[PDB]
Every structure is written in C-alpha cells, then in structure tokens.
Nucleic acid binder design. Structure first.
Lengths: 141, 570, 36, 133, 50, 59, 383
RNA sequence: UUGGAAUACAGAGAAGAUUAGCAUGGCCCCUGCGCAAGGAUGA
RNA sequence: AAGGUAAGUAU
RNA sequence: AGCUUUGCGCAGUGGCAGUAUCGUAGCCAAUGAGGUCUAUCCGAGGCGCGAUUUGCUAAUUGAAAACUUCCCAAUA
C-alpha cells in the first residue's frame, strides 16, 4: 500500500541518490494515486525485500518535486530511472528510450533479473547494458 | 507426465515409425538450391578450408558446460540460453543483412567496413567481437605489407625504382572512398600501361598510355548475400574512385584490388604493368591463401560460429611407422591387457581363482632405449566385482599419470598402442596433454613375451608393489649396433616366444640366452650369431605358418614375417 | 529497515486518500482531483 | 536520506551534476507575458464554456447512477470503521507482531455400512466368488 | 531471506590438490566425454527424431 | 621472417603485427615465458636414458 | 494491465487507511506496519484454504479482516474465471498473465474439490440402496456367464515376472530419461529405478510386501496443465509407490489379456490405432445387412456421447466390491486405498474419497473395468 | 651519445582473465614427542 | 511517427 | 630400572577428505540428549543453522595476463 520511502523534497532525492555506495538507487518517478503507478509500486515493494542488499528503491512525487521533471523528461507515468553509482545507466530493452522504464513490469522475477543485470553492469563500470528480454514486443499472442 | 505428449496415438518403438520422413530432407535441401546454393548465403565461403563434408558443428560449447556447472542465476541462465541464437544469426549474416531485406538507413560499425541495415543486436555484438581490436586496420596493413614485400622481391623484372606507401590516415583503411592511395610504385624512365580491365581478361595493348608512376589500392569489403559479386563491385568501385574529385591519386594509371572478406574472394581492376598481371594474380592468390590476419579472422569465425574444423584422420597404419620408429623423437607403447591380466587358479572341483596379478602394463619404448613398468598392486589393479570396462577406465587415469610425471619432451610424442578400443580412452586421456599426439598402431608389439619369459614373469609377481618400477631395455638391443634394428631383433625373438615360448628358448642361442647383464632384464645378443639363432625362431613362426597357413614354411616371406613379427597385420 | 517508518506510511496514505478521491473523501470528484 | 531537510540556496539539478536526457525533441517544454497568458486562458475558458453546464450535469447524473450499482471501496465497510473505534486501547496495543450440528458423517457411515452389508449378502449368490490367503 | 548480491566471480587464488579433489569429485568430466559436435552433412535420423 | 629467420606460425605473425601496430610488445613476464618456451623447443630439437641404464647396472 | 492491480491496490490502501484511522497512529507507529503482515497472512490463509485464527488480534479487527478477505476472495475468483474465459475464447494473453490465471484456477479448483469431498462425506455415497447391489448382481451374472477364473494374488512363480519389472522400469525411465537434467525428487526416483533394475528380486519382494501389507500412502502432489480450454490434472506420486503401482498395473493387464477378462468392443485396443479403429468402425457399419437399405422402411440412429461424471462421482465401496469380484481381495483393497489418499499442492492439502487419482499407474485398469461395468449395464446381458 | 618532436583519446572485458598441478591445513590409521597413571616380573 | 543514441576517458 | 594400557597436543607416514566434514554467537544436556526394535526401556548430545586453510608454481586465451622510458637527423 505504498509504504516504500518517498522523497518529500526534491533536493532530498538528489542527496539520497548521491549518498550511494556499491548499491543501485532505483528512483521511481510518478504519482502513487495512479493505478498503473500503483501496480508498479506494488511490484517494487514485492522486489524490495528480496534484493534490499544492493537494490534500494526510493519513490518520489512529480508534483512534490517538479524540478526533475524537465531534467530527464519526466512526462509519463510509471517511469523508472536506475540512477546508480551517481551515473544514469543506459538500460536497453528493445525500446526507443533506453534510459527509462515507464510501465509496470508484468512479473516480479523479470524486474529482479533486470535490476541484478543493472547492478552487474554498474559494478563493471560500463555506462550501458542490455536486457536479456527484449520489450519491443509484448508477446501479446 | 506433466508435459504434453503429441504422439499419444501410438508409442514409439512399439507400433514402429509409421511415417517415413527421409526423402523430405533431401527434397527440401535440393529444392532450396542444393547444398552449395544453401551454403552460399551462410558465410561458408568465409572459411578457407573446403569443409563441405566432415566438418563438426559444436551444438554445445565450453561456456555451456561452465554455465551448467556454475549453477547460474536467472539473468545468467538467459544469457547462456541466448548463445545459439547469436551463433546461427552470425552464421546467417549474409542472407539476413541484405539491402532488399531490412530496408532503411544504412549503418557501419564503429571502426570497420561492414554495413548493416537495421539494428540487429545479435549481429552487431557478434561482428564487434569478430572485428575486435581494429581487426580491419590490421588486415589492411597485413595485405598492404604483403603486396609491398611481393613487389620488392620481384622488383627486377618490374623495373621498380621505388615501391613505397603514402602517409595513409589511420581511418582511411575502412573509409568508403580511397582518397589516399595505398601503394605507390615509380619506375626508372617509362612504364607502358594498357586500358583498364579485369583480371580475367587476356588481351593487352600497352601503347594506351606511358607513365612513370603506378598506384595499387586494396579494397577491404564485406560481401552480402546479394552484393557478393566481386568483379562487378571491383569495376564499379574502380570507376567511382578513379573518376572522382575527392579521391586524390598521384598517378592516373594503376590497378585497384578488392578483397571480399565474407566471400573471401580476391579481385582487381584497372591498368597493369607489362607482364605483371599474372604476377599480381598469383601474388593475390598466395597471400589470400595464408595471410596472417586473414587466417586469424578465419579462426575467429570458426570459433564464434562453433564450426570445428573437420577432424583429421590419424595414421592408424604402422608399417611405415615401424621403419621410421627411430625417426620419431619420443614414442611409447603400453599393453592394456597386461595391467588387467589376472592369474587364474586350476582345480578339479574348486572354483578357479582368477585373482589379479599386478598393475604393470608391460609398457615398452624401443625408441627411448628403455621401458616403463607402471607396477601397481594386484588389488589396486583389479578390485572386487570390477568389470573389464572399469579396469580400462582406471588404467586410463594411470596411463595419463605416467605421461604427467614424465617431462613433456620425454613424454611419447606418438602413443602407438595397437589396442584401438583402449586407444580412445588413452586419446581422451591424451587430451590432458594437447602437445602430445596419439596415433593408431597397426603393428602390434608381442607383449606376451614378458608373460612367457620367466624373468619378466617373476617381475610380474615382483610388480605387485603399488609403487612404480623401472624396466630396463633388453641387452640384445644394446648389443645390436643398429638401434632401429634393435627392436626388430628383440621383436623377432619376442614374436616367436608369443607363438611358442618353449621353442623360442631352444631356438634362442644359449650363449645369447646366458648373457644377462645387471643393466638389462633380458640378455644380450651375439650380433650376427643371434640372427642365426633367431632364424630358428623365425623358422618356428615359419613352421607355424607352414603347418597352419597353406603357404609352406619357406613360402613365408621374410618381409611378411617381419611384419608378422611386429604384428602389422590386423 | 528498508520500509519507511509508521509516520511516513501514515502521511503517504493520507496524501493518497486526499488526492485519489475515487475511494476516499466525501465525494468522488476525479482521479487527480485536489478536492473530492 | 529520508526525513532530512533540504538546504536551500542550491539548485538540485545543477548541484548533482547531471546531463540533460534529451530523449526526443517536441516532447518537452525545453508581467506582459503573464498578462498575455491570463488573457489567452480567459479566452480558452470562454470557448470551453459553450457546453460545460450540460456536460457537467450529465456526468454528475451518470456518476450518481454508477454509485448506486457499486459504491466506493470504503463504503462497503463504513459501518465497520464506525464500529472500529470501539476496540479498547489495550487491544491493538498487544497485537501479535508475529505472523447443535451433529456429526453429519454419521449418515454417510450408516449408508456405507448398509451398502457393504447388502453387497456381502449378495455375495452368497456368487458361486464362483473367490478370496486370497 | 534477501537474495545474495551477485558479485563478480573470483577465480581460485591457488589451485590446490584438495581443490583439485573437489574438482575430481564434482565437475564436467562426464559431460566432456559426450561430444556435442554435429556433422555438416545430414544425419541418418529424421528431421524431428528428437 | 623473424629475428632467427624461422618460418613463424600465423598466430606469431599476427602477434608481431599487433605489437608493431600498438607500438609496444608483451610484458616482461610474457617475454620471459616466451624465451623459456623457445629454449625448451631448441633443447627438444637438439635431441636421458643412458644415466638411468648406468645407474640400474649397479645392483 | 492495471484494472485488477488497481482494484487490489484500492482494497489494500483502503483497509490500511481504515486501520490507521482506528489504530491511533499518534501513539503507536510500528505495529501498524506489522498489521499489514497479518493482512497478507489472512490472504494466504484464504488461498491455502487453511484455518486462520489469531486470538491476539482484537475481535473487531478480526471482523474487518474477514470483510476484507471475503471481498478480496470474491473479486479474485471473479477475475480468475473472467481471465480464463478470455483465454479460452481466443483473446491474446501474456505469459505472466497466463501463469497467474492458471495458478488462480488451480487454487479455485482445489477449494471446490475440497467442499465437494466434504459434501460427499456428510451426505454419504450417492449409490442408491440396492441399486449398486443390482449393478453388482448384473456384473457377477455376466462374469459367471463368461465363466472365467478370477485373477489370484501374485504367485511366487510367474512366467515373465522379471520382464514386467523391466517394462515398468523402462516406462518410469521414459518420463525423464531424455531430459537434460532432473529435479532432486526426479533424481531420487531415477536412483530408485536404477536400484530396482540392479536387484530385480529384492524389488519384487518389496513390491509384494507393499501390496499385501502397506495400506497407507504418502501425499501425491497435484499440478494442472493448461490446454487453454481446460485444466488437466497431473499427479506426482512417491517413486516407490509409483513403481509398485506400475508393476501392479502391468501384472493386471497381462492377466486380463491372458484370460479375455475385457471384451473386444472396448475402443482402446493395442491391435489398432485410433484411425484404424475409426476406419474399422465405418467398415463394420457398412457391413450390416440392412445398413443402408433400411431408409426404405426403417431408420438408423448413431449416438455418440460422454459420461461427464466419471472422475468425481464414484463411490469407493462399489469399486471395492467389483474389484474383489474381479481380482484378489488384498490387491483390490490396496488399489482402493491408494485411490483414497491425501492430495497436496503449493499450500493446500485435502483428502480424496469419492474421486479417483488419474495419476495412479493402475488407474487405467480400474477406469477401463468400470467403463466395462457401465457398458454391460447399458447394453444388456443378452446384447 | 647530444637535442627535440612526443575536438582529442581509445574503443565492446583490460574495472589484468581463463584453466591446471604439488605441499600444508582439517580429517583419520600407524608411529614418534611431551606426558597423567596403574599392573606384574627379575637380580 | 517510431520500436536503429555503444559505453569509457579528460578537454 | 625396564615394560604396558590410554588420551590430548605436537612431530612423521599412510588414509579418506560433496552421503566427505567442521562452524554455530542457535538449540535439547549426564540434573539425562534423543528412540519406530527393548518403553522398570536404549544412553548420547538431538536436530537446526553457516559452509567446505594457506602457500608454491605451471599452463591457456588475448594485441596487451600489469613490478616503479620512447623516438628522431647525424655522430661520439
């Protein structure tokens, strides 16, 4: 029920992302009252217990912190930016915008695999990393 | 069963394979354009080896074994499972990277000359792996250096005064247009050049032009499934580059060469030096045959596509090897049955006690001037309820252990063992030593002589110690002047002993028999006198050949007898 | 712990109820309605 | 660092040292002006007021009709939350943090016994009835 | 029970006989015997023999 | 042709190519390993059982 | 995909807000978060269909939890069957959505089978008094007319006793022999199969001892395969129980075939595959004397149907009686006891008393024999 | 041995890898060292 | 429209 | 005085050392662990949890497998 930590102030999120060491800071931009964003928050809550050792999730509200809306072009719901090691990582998953996941993951295990791949890429030092599962298609059929 | 079974109408191997689907494969492959037609778009021409048949395709690589053993995570499991897709997509690069297929904006890699239409992450990553570390610039430098060396070597007939290269910009190797000339060649006074043409032409009229300079350009291109026409590409590229404002050529007369890497095809177009056209054709063929960077690229392709080179056939024959045994630097042979030999008791009513004798394999090495006695405990040699296969598996570990203890140079370069069935585990054991090789031994050493000989028979009992023992070579071999024929003299007596041990002792001269030295398990030989004694031993085989085989004792030829002594026949 | 303290959870729930008026407030004005 | 005040006087975008994630043009925005904006907003409101009243009334009627079929989530337990405060203070304080009708089977047992007895009686007519030992 | 952090793999500092004994006890020795190589020519089995 | 003039393997030829290209060769330890391998190959080409036989002659 | 997620989030957020209104957050702060735990516990306590009683929690809190869980269960079942209908109709669905729908359907079916078995236990067997007796009398009269020797207990000496064990070992191995890897339970089953193959006599003695002595089995797990139109059950049994049942079924089949205990008219026959069966059926139809000229002065009727109540509408007493009339009483009792065992799942366990485990190795024989019973009843003794 | 030359850089892993052997440790048989201690014999 | 930005490194 | 019984630690050899083993800051304990054979009963921990030292050196791949000066015009 959206009990994850939330950035009341915009600058607080900035220093929270800055205060990172050997961990990935998943800043989930959006609004809790949105239904798709509610599903994304529920998925993040489910993941949080399993991967709290290196993956920290820290939500934020666009209305509360609108200064970062124009910084990374935050104009969609469910947006996720893996701002890790003080470096905005390039997560490529077969999408045009390979630096933003703006829709709730269908399954928790997929998100866990994605976040651990992001951690591996960040620790290796590369600023870009690909996804084992391409999302160019939704596998609707 | 938790999985669906489509073949529930009838059970396999119970109602039989009702549907015969054998001609379907042939019909499909031939209707697709034949084997060659299918392979024409599969980078097969990118490998110089004509592995049309006999090539091995590694379905599972070492990375698969590492992933299976390491108990990989979910993302690691997905990465390991996404390997064969990359494999065949690289294997299908020509027909999948065409121009009509995947229309859109063309794009080349970071520092190479491969144009790809539509972003294909698998092909992109495979290409940047294959062309890692400026491989395009490396192959361009290799080909230009080979051309320069070839031209310099034959500079006499070509009247070459200077053969140099310009200060080519590093990025000008993979550039679309050859703005900078590759090789410049200035002659002495004059140089007659004919009209531009292709290398397939024969006619020439050198009076077309007379220039004192000449240029040679190498075009590194990656042919697709539809743009693999080297000759047409060579013509078009020569016409475009020669007739262009951007391109700067110090000489207006010259020839441009082109190499299709994917097609591995060499071509050229333009003018020629008088009499150099066959020379340039032969030089291009020879360089493309064994170019260093090209060979490295081919090996990289073979590894990346998991297409292992067709395995060579080991010289299982040993008739030539027996004569050239002294020529081999290091060689050894071991009898598998000797290690697994078990003495059997005899009783009218009691059960026969087929207890193991010893772990020694009666190994020998005539080229090394000694023998190996891998003496092991009888119980260690053969355990309780131990099958022959189990003993062979344990013997293979001990066989590799003997090679492991010995130095690599001292280890047998060729392990010629007549036991073909046991050769494969030995060959599998030989995989621990890639430098050493294992070759089949058509000639079979009569290891039964050691069992027949009481001194070695006592040594078999003395081999019950688990520690390895030292088996000195026969004194007859040392007594013989020729080390190459030393084995033959020993084998001739040994072969007769295997056929008839008691007759061999009588046939062997007592003077040669009672010449045992402390430095040798077997006694010495009185040079030519031993051959006379060995003639009776040879006659013993001849008597066996005369009585058993239809050919008489005299009919048994010495050449065949020597092969029979060495066991050349199967 | 990873999760926020009780006061932060209560504040977040109050904000969600105040913003999303579909299941909170006196009347259901709109999903993003400031006042229900 | 949740729960900490933000030191003013510093721009969060510039102080962190980030790079503008220009995903795509024409996707982001990238006093006389205030007066003009107010005038244009007033003009837009005037244009929109052509149908506002009827649309709002119809939407309100539709929402009221929808509420009767299914109310809000908290409506299904409004009585429960009204009676929720009746719990004593010491009740939720000690909340554990860690995480008549006779035997109806008697009729089934009687029916099974009757069926077994009938089958055993019928077994007499089975001349070829066999057992094991 | 949080999942372990997938740190980058570190090889053995020094291959020991006891470590080799574990490698002898557990490994891919039997899998290496079964060759996964496939001939370029067609096999005698059907297309979907499986 | 290398310094000794022997016909190099294509792998060695490409190694020389890359060393010239980058302007620098292998490290000190790699050079020591290479010269040790070359010395071992030279010793093997020039060719211990005589000593063993002489020792075994004595009881 | 947010509608179901939206409603779940609305439910949980509304319940949390109501709790925080009732629970004085101005005094107690931490325990409220722990309250959510019970929520989830309650939810899974509903999903596992296991009793949930927390005396520490206040009674009004328990009532609120009950209301929340009843609303959540109603919504969850509704969306589960709605998504199942969407999938079976032909609508395109995702892999994760399909897996979630399959899990929900499995949970719902497990619950439903639970109250079905409870209702069968309370209301008793549905076999009418003297009606099952009449069916048994008809069956035994037909068998006496056939006049065949009933199958006895497994003798000490058999013609090909070890051959049956070899066939059973091959059948069990074929499940995962070609698989690249096997699970820990699968590895244990493979080891047991190898041990049985190594010592056929010891395995046969153990199987006979289990037949004549053992009457209580372990928990056979139940999974469901989604054919996208329905859920088909798969049952994992104990490897020792599995191999014993396989040998039992093979022995029963061999003894029945050796004595013609099953009439030829039963459609599944090893002699002819299904297409050959259909063509032989058509040829036999055409072979009748008045097959086609009957339209001159009569009619022809072809009726094809299926007994919808075969799995979960049987009384084990009738099965016991019929099997004892058809085979040795000890083997029949063991088979029926195996048919009455405990079924386990991810978190739900129940007892099967009216239904029959289709995953039993001998279930094929009992299903064929009972279908023979209905065939003899419907067709008539003379026919 | 003088003197200096020394967008760009590099580029799909280089944020130095992969595989393997011996000893020791631990375990345990035998033996030895240190050492608690009783038992009987002999002059 | 697109689903086709390699990252890294200091200027 | 010799000799012997036995165990710990250490020294040496041998042996096993992924149904091989310890660690536990957990937990039941000689006041009795824990039994389904023996329940006036056997007598040892039960069964969780945490996992399978250090040092030598080779070999392989790669352009480079990391130990504190290049190059240029001519010459001493």
């Amino acid at each position: 029920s959206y009990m994850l930590p939330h950035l009341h102030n915009g600058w607080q999120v900035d220093q929270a992302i800055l205060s990172e060491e050997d961990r990935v800071v998943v800043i989930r931009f959006g609004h809790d009252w949105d239904p798709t964003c509610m599903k994304m928050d529920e998925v993040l809550y489910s993941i949080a217990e399993k991967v709290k050792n290196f993956a920290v999730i820290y939500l934020v509200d666009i209305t509360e912190v609108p200064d970062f809306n124009k910084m990374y072009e935050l104009y969609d719901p469910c947006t996720v930016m893996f701002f890790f090691r003080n470096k905005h990582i390039m997560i490529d998953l077969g999408t045009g915008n390979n630096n933003k996941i703006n829709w709730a993951m269908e399954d928790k295990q997929e998100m866990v695999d994605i976040i651990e791949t992001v951690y591996r890429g960040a620790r290796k030092g590369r600023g870009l990393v690909v996804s084992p599962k391409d999302y160019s298609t939704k596998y609707r059929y | 069963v938790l999985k669906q079974n489509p073949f529930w109408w009838t059970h396999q191997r119970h109602d039989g394979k009702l549907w015969n689907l054998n001609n379907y494969r042939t019909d499909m492959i031939q209707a697709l354009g034949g084997v060659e037609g299918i392979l024409e778009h599969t980078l097969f021409k990118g490998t110089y080896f004509p592995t049309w048949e006999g090539l091995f395709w590694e379905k599972a690589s070492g990375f698969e074994e590492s992933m299976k053993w390491k108990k990989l995570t979910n993302a690691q499991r997905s990465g390991l499972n996404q390997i064969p897709n990359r494999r065949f997509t690289l294997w299908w690069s020509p027909t999948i990277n065409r121009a009509n297929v995947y229309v859109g904006f063309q794009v080349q890699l970071d520092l190479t000359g491969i144009f790809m239409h539509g972003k294909i992450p698998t092909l992109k990553i495979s290409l940047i792996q294959i062309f890692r570390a400026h491989l395009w610039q490396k192959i361009h430098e290799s080909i230009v250096m080979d051309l320069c060396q070839v031209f310099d070597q034959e500079l006499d007939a070509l009247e070459i005064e200077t053969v140099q290269k310009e200060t080519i910009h590093p990025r000008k190797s993979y550039k679309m247009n050859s703005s900078c000339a590759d090789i410049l060649l200035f002659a002495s006074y004059k140089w007659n050049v004919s009209r531009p043409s292709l290398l397939a032409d024969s006619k020439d009229v050198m009076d077309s032009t007379t220039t004192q300079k000449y240029w040679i350009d190498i075009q590194l291109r990656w042919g697709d499934y539809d743009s693999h026409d080297i000759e047409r590409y060579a013509r078009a590229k020569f016409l475009d580059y020669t007739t262009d404002n951007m391109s700067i050529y110090p000489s207006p007369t010259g020839v441009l060469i082109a190499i299709d890497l994917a097609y591995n095809l060499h071509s050229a177009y333009g003018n020629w030096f008088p009499g150099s056209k066959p020379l340039i054709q032969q030089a291009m063929a020879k360089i493309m045959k064994a170019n260093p960077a090209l060979y490295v690229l081919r090996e990289r392709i073979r590894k990346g596509l998991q297409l292992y080179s067709s395995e060579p056939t080991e010289p299982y024959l040993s008739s030539q090897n027996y004569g050239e045994l002294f020529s081999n630097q290091i060689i050894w042979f071991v009898d598998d049955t000797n290690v697994y030999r078990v003495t059997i008791h005899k009783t009218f009513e009691g059960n026969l006690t087929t207890k193991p004798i010893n772990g020694a394999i009666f190994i020998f090495n005539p080229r090394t001037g000694q023998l190996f006695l891998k003496i092991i405990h009888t119980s260690v040699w053969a355990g309780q309820k131990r099958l022959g296969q189990l003993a062979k598996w344990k013997t293979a570990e001990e066989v590799a252990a003997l090679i492991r203890s010995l130095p690599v140079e001292e280890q047998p370069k060729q392990i010629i063992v007549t036991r073909k069935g046991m050769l494969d585990p030995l060959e599998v054991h030989l995989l621990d030593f890639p430098n050493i090789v294992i070759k089949g031994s058509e000639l079979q050493l009569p290891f039964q002589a050691c069992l027949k000989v009481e001194k070695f028979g006592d040594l078999i009992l003395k081999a019950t110690e688990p520690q390895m023992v030292l088996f000195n070579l026969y004194d007859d071999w040392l007594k013989t002047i020729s080390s190459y024929t030393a084995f033959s003299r020993l084998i001739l007596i040994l072969r007769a002993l295997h056929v008839n041990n008691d007759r061999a002792k009588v046939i062997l001269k007592p003077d040669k028999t009672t010449i045992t030295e402390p430095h040798h398990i077997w006694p010495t030989l009185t040079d030519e006198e031993w051959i006379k004694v060995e003639v009776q031993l040879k006659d013993l085989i001849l008597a066996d050949y005369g009585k058993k085989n239809n050919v008489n004792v005299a009919s048994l030829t010495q050449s065949e007898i020597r092969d029979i002594i060495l066991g050349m026949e199967i | 712990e990873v999760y926020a303290p009780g006061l932060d959870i209560e504040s977040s729930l109050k904000q969600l109820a105040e913003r999303r008026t579909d299941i909170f407030g006196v009347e259901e004005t709109a999903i993003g309605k400031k006042i229900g | 660092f949740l729960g900490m005040p933000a030191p003013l006087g510093y721009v969060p975008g510039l102080g962190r040292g980030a790079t503008g994630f220009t995903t795509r043009s024409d996707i982001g925005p990238a006093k006389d002006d205030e007066e003009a904006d107010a005038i244009y907003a007033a003009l837009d409101k005037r244009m929109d007021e052509r149908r506002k009243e009827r649309r709002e009334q119809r939407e309100k009627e539709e929402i009221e009709k929808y509420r009767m079929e299914r109310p809000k989530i908290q409506q299904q337990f409004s009585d429960l939350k009204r009676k929720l405060a009746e719990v004593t203070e010491e009740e939720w304080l000690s909340i554990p943090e860690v995480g008549g009708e006779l035997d109806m089977r008697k009729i089934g047992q009687a029916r099974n016994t009757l069926m077994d007895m009938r089958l055993s009686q019928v077994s007499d007519s089975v001349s070829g009835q066999t057992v094991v030992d | 029970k949080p999942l372990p952090a997938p740190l980058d793999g570190q090889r053995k500092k020094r291959g020991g006989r006891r470590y080799r004994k574990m490698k002898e006890r557990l490994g891919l020795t039997e899998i290496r015997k079964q060759a996964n190589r496939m001939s370029f020519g067609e096999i005698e089995e059907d297309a979907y023999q499986e | 042709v290398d310094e000794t003039g022997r016909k190099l393997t294509p792998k060695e030829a490409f190694r020389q190519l890359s060393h010239r290209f980058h302007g620098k060769g292998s490290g000190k330890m790699k050079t020591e390993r290479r010269m040790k391998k070359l010395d071992e190959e030279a010793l093997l080409k020039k060719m211990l059982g005589t000593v063993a036989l002489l020792q075994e002659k004595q009881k | 995909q947010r509608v179901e997620s939206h409603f779940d989030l609305e439910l949980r957020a509304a319940v949390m807000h109501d709790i925080l209104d009732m629970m004085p957050e101005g005094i107690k702060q931490n325990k409220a978060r722990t309250i959510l735990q019970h929520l989830s516990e309650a939810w899974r306590c509903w999903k596992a269909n296991i009793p949930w009683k927390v005396p520490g929690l206040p009674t009004p809190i328990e009532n609120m939890i009950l209301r929340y869980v009843k609303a959540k269960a109603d919504w969850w079942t509704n969306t589960a069957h709605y998504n199942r209908e969407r999938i079976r109709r032909g609508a395109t669905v995702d892999k994760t959505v399909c897996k979630k729908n399959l899990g929900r359907l499995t949970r719902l079916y497990l619950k439903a089978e639970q109250e079905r078995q409870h209702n069968y236990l309370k209301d008793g067997p549905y076999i009418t008094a003297e009606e099952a007796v009449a069916v048994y009398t008809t069956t035994v009269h037909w068998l006496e007319s056939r006049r065949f020797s009933p199958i006895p207990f497994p003798p000490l000496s058999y013609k090909h006793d070890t051959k049956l064990l070899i066939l059973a070992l091959e059948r069990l191995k074929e499940a995962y022999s070609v698989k690249s890897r096997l699970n820990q339970s699968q590895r244990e089953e493979l080891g047991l199969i190898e041990q049985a193959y190594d010592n056929p006599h010891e395995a046969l003695s153990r199987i006979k001892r289990h037949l004549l002595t053992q009457r209580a089995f372990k928990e056979v797990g139940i999974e469901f395969m989604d054919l996208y139109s329905h859920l088909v059950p798969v049952y994992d049994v104990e490897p020792l129980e599995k191999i014993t049942d396989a040998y039992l079924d093979q022995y029963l089949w061999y003894e029945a075939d050796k004595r013609r205990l099953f009439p030829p008219w039963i459609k599944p026959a090893d002699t002819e595959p299904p297409p050959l069966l259909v063509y032989k059926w058509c040829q036999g139809i055409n072979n009748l004397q008045d097959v086609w000229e009957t339209s001159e002065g009569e009619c022809n009727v072809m009726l094809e149907s299926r007994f919808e109540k075969m799995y979960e509408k049987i009384d084990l007493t009738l099965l016991n009686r019929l099997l004892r009339l058809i085979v040795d009483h000890n083997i029949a009792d063991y088979m029926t006891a195996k048919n009455n065992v405990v079924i386990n799942y991810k978190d739900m366990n129940h007892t099967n008393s009216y239904g029959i485990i289709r995953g039993l190795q001998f279930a094929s024989f009992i299903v064929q024999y009972y279908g023979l019973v209905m065939d003899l009843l419907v067709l008539g003794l003379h026919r």
